Amino acid sequence: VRDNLAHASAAMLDVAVLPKPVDLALEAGYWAQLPANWQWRPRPAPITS
Amino acid sequence: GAIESRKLLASETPVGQFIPYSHHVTDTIISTKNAEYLSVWKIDGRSHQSASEADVFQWIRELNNTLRGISSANLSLWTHIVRRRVYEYPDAEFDNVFCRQLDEKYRESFTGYNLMVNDLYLTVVYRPVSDKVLSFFAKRERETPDQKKHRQESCIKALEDINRTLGQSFKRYGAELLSVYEKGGHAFSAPLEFLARLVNGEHIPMPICRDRFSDYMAVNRPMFSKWGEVGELRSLTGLRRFGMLEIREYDDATEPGQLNVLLESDYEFVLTHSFSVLSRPAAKEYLQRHQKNLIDARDVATDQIEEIDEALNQLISGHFVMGEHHCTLTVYGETVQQVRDNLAHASAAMLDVAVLPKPVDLALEAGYWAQLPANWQWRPRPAPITSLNFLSFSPFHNFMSGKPTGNPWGPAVTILKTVSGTPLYFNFHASKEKRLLGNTMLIGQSSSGKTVLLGFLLAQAQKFKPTIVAFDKDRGMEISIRAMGGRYLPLKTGEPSGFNPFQLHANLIFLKQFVKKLAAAEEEIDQAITAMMSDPTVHARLVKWCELDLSTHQIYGFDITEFLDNPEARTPVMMYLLYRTESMIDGRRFMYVFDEFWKPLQDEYFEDLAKNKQKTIRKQNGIFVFATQEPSDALESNIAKTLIQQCATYIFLANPKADYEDYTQGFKLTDSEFELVRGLGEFSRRFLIKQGDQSALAEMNLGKFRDFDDELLVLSGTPDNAEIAESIIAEVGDDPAVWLPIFLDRVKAERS
Amino acid sequence: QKNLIDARDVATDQIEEIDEALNQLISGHFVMGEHHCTLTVYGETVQQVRDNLAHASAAMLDVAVLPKPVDLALEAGYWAQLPANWQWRPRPAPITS
Amino acid sequence: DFDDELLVLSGTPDNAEIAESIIAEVGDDPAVWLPIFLDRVKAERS
Amino acid sequence: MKPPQQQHEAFPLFKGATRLPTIWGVPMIPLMAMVMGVAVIALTVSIWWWALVPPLWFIMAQITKNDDKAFRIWWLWIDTKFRNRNKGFWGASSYSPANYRKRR
Amino acid sequence: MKPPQQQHEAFPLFKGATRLPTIWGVPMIPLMAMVMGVAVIALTVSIWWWALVPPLWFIMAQITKNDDKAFRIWWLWIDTKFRNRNKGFWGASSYSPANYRKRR
Secondary structure, eight states: OHHHHHHHHHHHHHSSOOOOOOOSOHHHHHHTTSTTOOTTOSSOOOOOO | OHHHHHHHHHHSOBGGGGOOOOOEEETTEEOOTTSOEEEEEEEOOBOOTTOOHHHHHHHHHHHHHHHHHHOOTTOEEEEEEEEEOOOOSOOOOOOSHHHHHHHHHHHHTTTTSOOOEEEEEEEEEEOSOOOSSHHHHHHTSOOOHHHHHHHHHHHHHHHHHHHHHHHHHTSSSOOEEOOEEEETTEEEEHHHHHHHHHHHSSOOOOBOOSSOTTTTTOOSEEEEOTTOSEEEEEOSSOEEEEEEEEEEEOOSOOOSOTTGGGTSSSSOEEEEEEEEEOOHHHHHHHHHHHHHHHHSOSSSOSHHHHHHHHHHHHHHHSSOOOEEEEEEEEEEESSHHHHHHHHHHHHHHHHHSSOEEEOOOSOHHHHHHTTSTTOOTTOSSOEEEOHHHHHHHOOOBOOOOOOSSSBTTBSOSEEEEESSSOOEEEOSOBSOOOOOBOOEEEEOSSOTHHHHHHHHHHHHHGGGOOEEEEOBSTTTTHHHHHHSSEEOOOOOTTSOOSSOSOOOOHHHHHHHHHHHHOOOOOOTTTTHHHHHHHOOHHHHHHHHTOOOOOSSOSEEOOBOSSOSSOHHHHHHHHHHHHHHHHHHHTTSOEEEEOSOSHHHHTTSSHHHHHHHHHHHHHHTTOOEEEEESOHHHHTTSHHHHHHHHHOOEEEEEOOTTOOHHHHHHSSOOOHHHHHHHHHSOTTOOOEEEEESSOOBOEEOOOSOOOOOHHHHHHHSOOHHHHHHHHHHHHHHOOSOGGGHHHHHHHHHHHTO | OHHHHSSSSOOHHHHHHHHHHHHHHHHSOOOEEEEOOOOOOOOSSHHHHHHHHHHHHHHHHHTTOOOOOOSSOHHHHHHTSSTTOOTTOSOOEEEEO | OOHHHHHHHSOOHHHHHHHHHHHHHHOOSOGGGHHHHHHHHHHHTO | OOSOOOOSOOOOOTTTTSSOSOSSSSOHHHHHHHHHHHHHHHHHOSTTTTTTHHHHHHHHHHHHHHSTTHHHHHHHIIIIIITOSOHHHHSSEEOBSSOOSSOO | OOSOOOOSOOOOOTTTTSSOSOSSSSOHHHHHHHHHHHHHHHHHOSTTTTTTHHHHHHHHHHHHHHSTTHHHHHHHHIIIIITOSOHHHHSSOOOOSSOOSSOO
């Protein structure tokens, strides 16, 4: 899974986005997967539609 | 003195300090004293002489885009365009008089032509961490041997990923990864040979032993001069004087190929480019320093502000990363004056393009050790450059030059001169169209040079002593076939040849003979002819109106010009001849050679047999050589699709009536390639060779060079000449192929 | 063994081979000693001597043995030939019997 | 792989008529009859 | 003759290779050496120890503005060609391919 | 390889995701916590209670300018991973799929 994450970060860095692995918020990010979990958003950012 | 020698050598400093290498940790990856794992890529560069200007820029863009993913601060690239004299190609050994004399004349024809070929090597290293300061602090601490194993495993995985990505990116290029090759019951290291060549100046095979790579790598004593710009290597083979050079100034433009002028030249050298990629933090810091110093303008320049403003946007959002670059060029020469004048020539060539070089002095050994891919600290003059600019400096452009030795069947069959000037080692086997494909298609338009080229290739390929079976047209190569050991077997009208339609398993073979014999049919004769074959009104008519010995010779032919009207002659003729020669295919080396596709089209089942039999013979020393005098109508054939698909080496002869459509859809070649090809006016000798994806406008010539007097007439094909020489052969009647002098008298009328 | 262990890059193959040899030493009862090999060709002229050296090196490299040419300490190496001249040995190396 | 099936999937008048000759010779409703035809593959797959 | 061509379709370098790291007109590392020398003089005398700094520093600045990072070249020379012994005996700096004969 | 393509037909983001809410260089909620801590110190002593505020506040500002809204990450960690008990027993934070056995 760690090497898979390295591959995925390489793939994201290929396009202009720059990702960073989530640490200290693993459960927060995991519960953020559920569609109804508003409060567990780890890193909300303002973007255009 | 004996004690004096001991105390002197005890004072002497070994060279192992400057060679940071150790065990192969992986078959393709070398270690380092500082855990900087290394892998060498041997690249067969892309052909650039095609001169497709926009496509060069497109290639650079694609290389940058594919490199982006690999670009990370823990990486570096070292490019080495080593250009060497070649000794591996051996003089051929011959038996027949005509071929041997042609070989002698052609070898004499290269007195004064450079035989040096340049091959490109890219070495990529993976330093674990590129911290500016923290690396020094971390270096002085002990580590857990299991955690060092963890670093090993992670670094190897990362480097293997890098190599896979680069190999996928370099599909159009050679993209060959050097790895361990074993020979003689003991392992050897191919990558070690390259590093030795860099450090020793000569290709010395390096066995891999239990000791470390550094201690026994060097076998030649280097002697760098004091207060000098050149150095001398002392070796058993000879003493090599090498001079170095450095680039100190750059230009903005970086139009790709700014360094290509050095490739075609007369001085043997090694060119180094190191691109120690730099992390985006430091990258934007370096950019901001220039930005600020420009903002200190005092009206220095208005344009430069909007020339640099886009830099931030492109660095954040583009696919390029800054880097650290130095270029060092090492000219090898046998005398101090010669290397110095070579350096003057090289500096002139560099000053031709906008770069300004300056000879390296007081850092000769530093620049020399900088050549080794793993020597970080010995960089003499690192400079910050854009990644696009790095690909501009090192665009992997190379004049195509086939492998001189090591090719399947041994050495390159011929050496052909090139318009650019780099000799081309022609050979049938090509990388891509497992066992290499040897197919060749010599398309051309009514140029006798097709016959001359084919005869010259046959005469030179006689070196392997290969079995050759020919189907010529218009009596073109009767004299050439007779010149070497061979039987022409002319299929003239009015006399059936030595073979009768019968043959002497065999019933299975003659079955299809019955079927093809069926003309003017085909249902009642499915087996009523077969039973008589166990042991047709028009069939006995053809039998009454028909109006051999193999393996005693090595070359064969067939005067097959007659059967351009009725395939029911031509189709059984090819069926019988192919079945006859099928036995000798597995015996030794074979090269089928043809002169037409429409007669092969007349078979209507030769495709059915060939679709598998070409693979089958191709597995065991099988080669086809195809020709076409009307390429325009060639591809129309249903079999022509397989003909174009299976071809390995594509050779084009000047066609004034060239087609854009055909040469694009089939005969796959670029638009610039087509323009170059059509640029050949009629009767120009030069002929493009698209051996593999790379291509080069190689040419062959035979004129007096300060020769070829008899061979000029023999190679060509003329009905008058062929019939008259047949008259001589009838008069002499001598199996001693050396009979040539007697015909040389009858040359009086033609050569008057 | 300890010296090979203390390194920046760990080579698991070489360390395992040396450990196997260590195990073999007690069990496969072969003695170890200091070893050195020198080849002293003869040629009438130095150019012929250098050619002979090149041919010997090529023949050796056909096998997986790499000769290291001697540029200096040829005096020590030559005087090493005489039996009982231990001191002048160029570079003794412990070699299994 | 696919050695026998490569010929069977394709369509050729010569191949089809010859295989009809085999089927006439064997005359077996046991569709497993394939091996007998596999011998006559000798001429085509030579 | 050359794949090079006169085209404006260029990837500008921006000439940031002239604006290499500097603090007061000099790279810090050679200036660190200058400070070390000034302290060495301060060991002998304090009156002219600080006084000697501006001359040497100005020399450093004016040299660097001419040919940048030449001090790296100076250090490489001192480290490699200077430190090597037996330069006279061989007629040039030499590095024995073979290791120490004793190595004990 | 990718539907992505290098085109200028772009929908710019404007990079307003860097200019997230702030008042004096910090988000108000963490600064509210800083004010609460300053009041907590003011419970102990008033001399250095206001004095302690600028150091912590400057730390907040300089951290936020580096990586914005990291304080939300800190709060999520404290709330979820820290508050969970029996972390050592399971070797990691665990959440029983089944409800309380008693639940009475």
